[PDB]
UniProtKB/Swiss-Prot annotation, chain A:
GO molecular function (one): IgE binding
Positions in coiled-coil regions: none
Functional note: High-affinity receptor for immunoglobulin epsilon/IgE. Mediates IgE effector functions in myeloid cells. Upon IgE binding and antigen/allergen cross-linking initiates signaling pathways that lead to myeloid cell activation and differentiation. On mast cells, basophils and eosinophils stimulates the secretion of vasoactive amines, lipid mediators and cytokines that contribute to inflammatory response, tissue remodeling and cytotoxicity against microbes.
Full-protein positions shown: 29 to 197 of 257
Domain Ig-like: 2-82, 83-165
Extracellular side: 1-169
Subunit structure: Tetramer of an alpha chain, a beta chain, and two disulfide linked gamma chains. Interacts with IGHE (via CH3 region).
Residues carrying sugar: 18, 39, 47, 71, 132, 137, 163
Keywords tagged on the record: Cell membrane, Disulfide bond, Glycoprotein, IgE-binding protein, Immunoglobulin domain, Membrane, Receptor, Repeat, Signal, Transmembrane, Transmembrane helix
UniProt protein name: High affinity immunoglobulin epsilon receptor subunit alpha
Subcellular location: Cell membrane
Tissue spec: Expressed in eosinophils.
Chain's gene name: FCER1A
GO biological process, alphabetically ordered: cell surface receptor signaling pathway; eosinophil degranulation; immunoglobulin mediated immune response; mast cell degranulation; type 2 immune response; type I hypersensitivity
Curated annotation (Swiss-Prot), chains B, C:
Gene Ontology CC terms, in alphabetical order: extracellular region; extracellular space; IgE B cell receptor complex; IgE immunoglobulin complex; immunoglobulin complex, circulating; plasma membrane
Residues that carry a glycan: 39, 145, 157, 168
Keyword Secreted: yes
GO terms classed as biological process: adaptive immune memory response; adaptive immune response; antibacterial humoral response; antibody-dependent cellular cytotoxicity; B cell antigen processing and presentation; B cell proliferation; B cell receptor signaling pathway; complement activation, classical pathway
Disulfide bonds: 28-86, 132-192, 238-298
Domain Ig-like: start-end pairs: 5-103, 107-211, 217-316
Superkingdom of origin: Eukaryota
Protein name: Immunoglobulin heavy constant epsilon
Parts of the chain on the Extracellular side: 1-316
Function: Constant region of immunoglobulin heavy chains. Immunoglobulins, also known as antibodies, are membrane-bound or secreted glycoproteins produced by B lymphocytes. In the recognition phase of humoral immunity, the membrane-bound immunoglobulins serve as receptors which, upon binding of a specific antigen, trigger the clonal expansion and differentiation of B lymphocytes into immunoglobulins-secreting plasma cells. Secreted immunoglobulins mediate the effector phase of humoral immunity, which results in the elimination of bound antigens.
Signal peptide limits: none
GO molecular-function term, one example from the UniProt record: antigen binding
Keywords: Adaptive immunity, Cell membrane, Disulfide bond, Glycoprotein, Immunity, Immunoglobulin, Immunoglobulin domain, Inflammatory response, Membrane, Repeat, Secreted, Transmembrane, Transmembrane helix
Length: 169, 319, 319
């Protein structure tokens, strides 16, 4: 089957941001045309890449793609928020040893200072300016509800929490 | 017709390592003007400082006068980012210029505050209002959306709106909404909602009558004794304590006039060790006032006071 | 004999929002010297600037002369962090002063605070200390270099260096240095200097005694009358006012021994309407205490109090 790829990879964006869903698999059948499925309704896009430009609230929800095969491509989910700080994450479920990037992101490229990440309540790491967390070997204990406190325009903002869980491969 | 004076402020330079000197001099220069009476007042975030802390000098060259005023500040105050204003009064006309600690970059974001009605306004004036004050917005393009609502869905009254540019370069917006007296007393909740296209999300504040228990204030008023020097100043004080909830209005009354609020100072409510809050109020009085009438009444307006939401106590300085 | 002229550099103001103006004026002042030949040259990073870029003028008052020179710089040059030197040549001898773009005390978001001695520690215990606290550092490896110094170069003692990681993922470092009582009272300035490997430059804080006028505190003490239903409790109120500078300690004593600080609530110093500051102190007492001894002493420690920087007033609840 084909799988669904995200550029940028992050399945959690802010309002107004772009994202491009590309989706591909083994070339047993030649690449001719694709079908798209936002929420369940068939979308009017044929091209193999769908350009979701200027996100609205209704742009949330289950996404899916399909080719001329007989079986469909899993339901990637895209949440869209409007807020001050979104703790973005690469993937919501991972298998050990794969890369995991976390990034405490601010509205429209704005720079968040005094950033501290929390994993399950405790202070995982603090840095003066914004940073990635990058763990290449996510342990089974890495599973947690994460969230980040930041400082944008001198004022304090907490991101909505997001629970993530690793599994044994 | 006279030539316009102009005003500019120079300051001490920090040194070759970037370090502040231990004191900072601010020099307000009032260039060539038509000779006349002139006053210079320095303000720190708008409040007048005692004239003893600064000097002033006036020279005349030919037919033109020149004036300079010098203010001395500690390094700590300068580093605390307070704003200083040079206020020039000349022939009944006011000029001004402002300064604060310099900076390479000055980020700021919008913040919002929402008050409750004062007990004085609720129970004496019988015209309660609430105020939503939004400060430190960046003066971008466009008006800032400010909407009032009630949790019950019942209609709101028309509000009034003021927008005022500040010395530090921001734009403070104040919105005042009249509230129903019975509505407020019966526990209605009012919400202020702030929107703007450049904001990430809406800012929301809400206010409602405090749900804590009630307790009436105790009041005690005192006068300080006579001693040398302070012959014509006999500072009075009032202690208001053991009240619940914390919101209280304190005024001073003298000879059937309620004196302006600016005459006296009042501390912020703080918790007593046991049960309730307390405040102190301090009022400096003059010889002519107590010779007019020496009875001074400290009055508290508070939701738990009985029988009419007021409590008052008189003091006489002579006895 | 050699006559040392003094040199000082003043500069233009940025405005009330901290933004730079289109050009920067620097004003080099040579104030109060025996008249003679004088030349003023400006250097930008050690090279002589063109003569037409600055203008000098001279006045005379009595015997003493005064000279000034004004240099105009573009905003860009000021912001490039070049060093500007005012070079005064008087009777063939050279006198210099220098400046460069300042540095705003918060390079990587860290904060540092430096306290003054408490008056109680200084005048009663005669063991004054100062404390330097630096917060919001990263918990990385490599110990912070903390150094103390006096502007005069005289020796300092060892301090209690202590670090601890916080529950919020930050690291705070605190150090307390004992200082000489006389050293402080005669106006020494103490400097706390912190260097971390990740910080781009060293961060410094400085503290020194006040430069304002001196005023001893007035102390007044009152006992509340008995309130119905509270036979076994009373509140004592102490008013401390018209002191300068603002630093003050308040203690309560009973039976010649100082009561714990948790027993009483004291406000922060706030300005009166004229000269000086005031505070109120509040102490609730019990029947067992005043039956043990019904005399309670409100004592203020303040740098302006004579003869031993301490003034007190006793009060009796029964009378
Ligand atoms: C640039 O200049 C402007 C104006 O000079 C500054 O704006 C100030 O902003 C601060 C906060 O950012 C304001 O402080 C707030 O004032 C509110 C107004 O309340 C007044 O009225 C009530 C009665 O309704 C009185 O009881 C009260 O004492 C005031 O007189 C307060 O309600 C706010 O209190 C809130 O914060 C405190 C903590 O500080 C809480 O304990 C409270 O519960 C409450 O949540 C607050 O004090 C200030 O009023 C603004 N100035 C003016 C003139 O309005 C900018 O700050 C300045 N910019 C910079 C960078 O300095
Ligand atoms: C991560 O967590 C740490 C701690 O867990 C936070 O660090 C705190 O930072 C705040 C702000 O920097 C500290 O608050 C400061 O406390 C000082 C204590 O002074 C003592 O002495 C005076 C005089 O005797 C007393 O009045 C006071 O109550 C204390 O007993 C204050 O002096 C500081 O004053 C500063 O703020 C005031 C306004 O409130 C200004 O007027 C002053 O000029 C000065 O700027 C300040 O209030 C706090 O103490 C720190 N915690 C600890 C345990 O020390 C980090 O901030 C946090 N990081 C993030 C990103 O949230
Ligand atoms: C596809 O399914 C999605 C999830 O079932 C659904 O997402 C939801 O969309 C609504 C509005 O489009 C969002 O509501 C937002 O707007 C209201 C009004 O301002 C706010 O009060 C809400 O808090 C929110 O911001 C929902 O939040 C959103 N749900 C999720 C989980 O994101 C899509 O609308 C569906 N799309 C179609 C075309 O059916
Ligand atoms: C979204 O995509 C379009 C098409 O490339 C682009 O022009 C637009 O700028 C994007 N949105 C933003 C906010 O950059
Ligand atoms: C986080 O990583 C992504 C790519 O992995 C990068 O584009 C982004 O800038 C990083 N975040 C920060 C704050 O640098
Ligand atoms: C993620 O973790 C939190 C923390 O216990 C949990 O309450 C939440 O339900 C989890 N999310 C899902 C989808 O199971």
């Amino acid at each position: 089957k084909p799988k669904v790829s995200l550029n940028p990879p992050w399945n959690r964006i802010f309002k107004g941001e772009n994202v491009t869903l590309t989706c591909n698999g083994n070339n047993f059948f030649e690449v001719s045309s694709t079908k798209w499925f936002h929420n369940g309704s068939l979308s009017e896009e044929t091209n193999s890449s769908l350009n979701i430009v200027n996100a609205k609230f209704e742009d949330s929800g289950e996404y899916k793609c399909q080719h001329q095969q007989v079986n469909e491509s899993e339901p990637v989910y895209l949440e869209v928020f409007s807020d001050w700080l979104l703790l973005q994450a690469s993937a919501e479920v991972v298998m050990e040893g794969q890369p995991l990037f976390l990034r405490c992101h601010g509205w429209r490229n704005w720079d968040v200072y005094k950033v501290i990440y929390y994993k399950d309540g405790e202070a995982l790491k603090y840095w003066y300016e914004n940073h990635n967390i990058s763990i290449t070997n996510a342990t089974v204990e890495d599973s947690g509800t994460y969230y980040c406190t930041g400082k944008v325009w001198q004022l304090d903002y907490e991101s909505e929490p997001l629970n993530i869980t690793v599994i044994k491969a | 017709d006279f030539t316009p004076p102009t005003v500019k402020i120079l300051q001490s330079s920090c040194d070759g390592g970037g370090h502040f000197p231990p004191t900072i001099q601010l020099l307000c220069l009032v260039s060539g003007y038509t000779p006349g009476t002139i006053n210079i007042t320095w303000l720190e975030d708008g409040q007048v400082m005692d004239v003893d802390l600064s000097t002033a000098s006036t020279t005349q060259e030919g037919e033109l006068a020149s004036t300079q005023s010098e203010l001395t500040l500690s390094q700590k105050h300068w580093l605390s980012d307070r704003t200083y204003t040079c206020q020039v009064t000349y022939q009944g006309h006011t000029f001004e210029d402002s300064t604060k600690k310099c900076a390479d970059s000055n980020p700021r974001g919008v913040s919002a505050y929402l008050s409750r009605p004062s007990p004085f306004d609720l129970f004496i004036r019988k015209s309660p209002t609430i105020t939503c004050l939004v400060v430190d917005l960046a003066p971008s393009k466009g008006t800032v959306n400010l909407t009032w609502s009630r949790a019950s869905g019942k209609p709101v009254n028309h509000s009034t709106r003021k927008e005022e540019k500040q010395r530090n370069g921001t734009l403070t917006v104040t919105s005042t909404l009249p509230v129903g007296t019975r509505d407020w007393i019966e526990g209605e909740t009012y919400q202020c909602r702030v929107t703007h296209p450049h904001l990430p999300r809406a800012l929301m504040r809400s206010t409602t009558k405090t749900s804590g228990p009630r307790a009436a204030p105790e009041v005690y008023a005192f006068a300080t004794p006579e001693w040398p020097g302070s012959r014509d100043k006999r500072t009075l004080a009032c202690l208001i304590q053991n009240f619940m909830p914390e919101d209280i209005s304190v005024q001073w009354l003298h000879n059937e006039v309620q004196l302006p609020d600016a005459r006296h100072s009042t501390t912020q409510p703080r918790k007593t060790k046991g049960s309730g809050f307390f405040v102190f109020s301090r009022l400096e009085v003059t010889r002519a006032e107590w010779e007019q009438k020496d009875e001074f009444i400290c009055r508290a307006v508070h939701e738990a006071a009985s029988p009419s939401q007021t409590v008052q106590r008189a003091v006489s300085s002579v006895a």
